[model samples]
Target: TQSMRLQQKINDLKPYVRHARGPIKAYGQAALDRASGAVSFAELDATHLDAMVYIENQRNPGLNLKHFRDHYYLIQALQSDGPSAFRAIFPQTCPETGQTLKHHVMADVRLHQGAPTIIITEPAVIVGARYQQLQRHNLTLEDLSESGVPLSQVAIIETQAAATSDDCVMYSLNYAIKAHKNAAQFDDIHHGLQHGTLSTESESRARTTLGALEASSSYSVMHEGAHAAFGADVLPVDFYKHGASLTQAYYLMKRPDGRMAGRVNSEGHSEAENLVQRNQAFRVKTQFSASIDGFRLQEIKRVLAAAQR
Candidate 1:
């Protein structure tokens, strides 16, 4: 029954998949031809490649692929560094899309195949798990621990529906702060476990620290789920995505003319939030976890940099 149902679903998605693959495959081919080895199999294997191209195409229709290599590199740089680094390294606005680096990156993150629910345990390393093991808007504390991320660095990036006064629905990514003290506490627990030397006080402290982490994680999951559940009730003709980081929230929406438009605010406010929201946002239903010979982002980065050199 499962196989039959999946086959039927695939049949329904066939047309959309064909349309997406045509441009993406062409884009990939053009990048490879113009800049040999610029596009790697690993990057191709990434689930977001199609979504990236779709977002860009929607933002700037009829754009040439001459700068495909540069766009690929820009994404790599963004992954390596943060949004602030974009202004320092790349141009303020994309030459092709004519949009601010902040706006472009926010759009990328929103439509990203991993958007709404990507768990970034470490920079450069995207965590995944078996589909059956995860539910929509739910990643257990056990799943978090198994990710092997230092406690402080664990970031559960989420985007979900929001209430707005406008006709469109709004989904916002809550990019919260990643504090440092939790990592120190985790290190203490790890050291104690290795040496069998945690005192009563230390053991109690570890319990408290872990409890805090679990509670926070649980609260976040429920909050995200609540938003997603709410969105399912409101069907909108067009929906917008908002990215909230640090102090400002970047609001972006695809215009009817097939261009991307948005604004920045010092305060956390948006016109879209006033819009009336979601048939339902697409969610990642499957993830797989595995590693051979211990994968590390630092090693991959060094090799990639050297390869270019």
Candidate 2:
């Protein structure tokens, strides 16, 4: 009867076969094979029972806490088979959510925990520019910097072009671009200037516009500042050495059938494309998502909360 019961459980796992990789399938099969050979249910020890519990939890987080209790009996089951097995087969438990944490949420936690601050020689220049721009727009920077608001935590820094020469920017954020590239690869503001991409008259006009908006409203400042902070790392490799024209062409025509086919676009892509690409790369490299799920939304919430705090 026990053998029949175990077989039934294995049969139930068929629907999710596509999602199960080699090791998971092998483990499940081995458990079933062992159960079939047992003389009685009593033959199963605590370790065997724990393996069962862990398998069940892997398939369904909705499994009751009692399942975890059973699984806890076999602590060794939690040990990863190897370094490559870092991503949990089962959804991770989060204290705050009470539900299995999603990938994005996990990614966000990692990003915030790992994020580093920007350092600059002239914080006053940035603040002063913001102040003047806000006044011109009939707004008060001081009001925008009030506590419990998004703008209160804004960081502004000024560095010489030479000082910024190395990479122009760096964010310890663990996103794909930052993971793959460094600051020196992205310092070129020439693209925006050369392409007439800015809706404003000149590069200075664009900078002034951003300063005014940032100073006039706290939320606005934080939002734009985040962009400015991260945007410093958007330029392509060639932009630093060659020029903006090649970078623009590479970004504009980076499809399989395009003239720059097979060439990578340094500009990155829309958020959706970025997510897809990252997921694909993760699967190819590690067979799992590198960061937590729902990371983007969670990070934004975390950033806003930090700003307020």
What lDDT does the true structure give each of the candidates? 0.24, 0.26
Candidate 2 global lDDT: 0.26
Name the regions of candidate 2 deviating beyond 4 angstroms: 1-174, 181-233, 237-262, 265-309
The number of the candidate with the highest lDDT is 2
**Residue 145 deviation, candidate 2, in Å?**
11
lDDT (tens digit, per residue) of candidate 1 on 202-250: 2232223222343556533221211111111121212222211111112
| Residue pairs of candidate 1 with colliding backbone atoms | 129-287, 164-273, 164-274, 164-275, 165-274, 165-275, 166-274, 166-275, 166-276, 169-277
Model 1, runs deviating above 4 Å: 1-149, 161-273, 277-309
Q: How far does residue 42 in candidate 1 sit from its true spot (Å)? A: 17
1-309: candidate 2 lDDT, tens digit per residue: 122322444344433433444644443343434323421212222223334334333444433111222111112222323221111111123333344321110010000121112111121123233253222111211222232213212222221111111111111112222212433321222223123232222232224335555556644543332223212223232111111122333343453434222233345654322323332332212133222211221222232233334
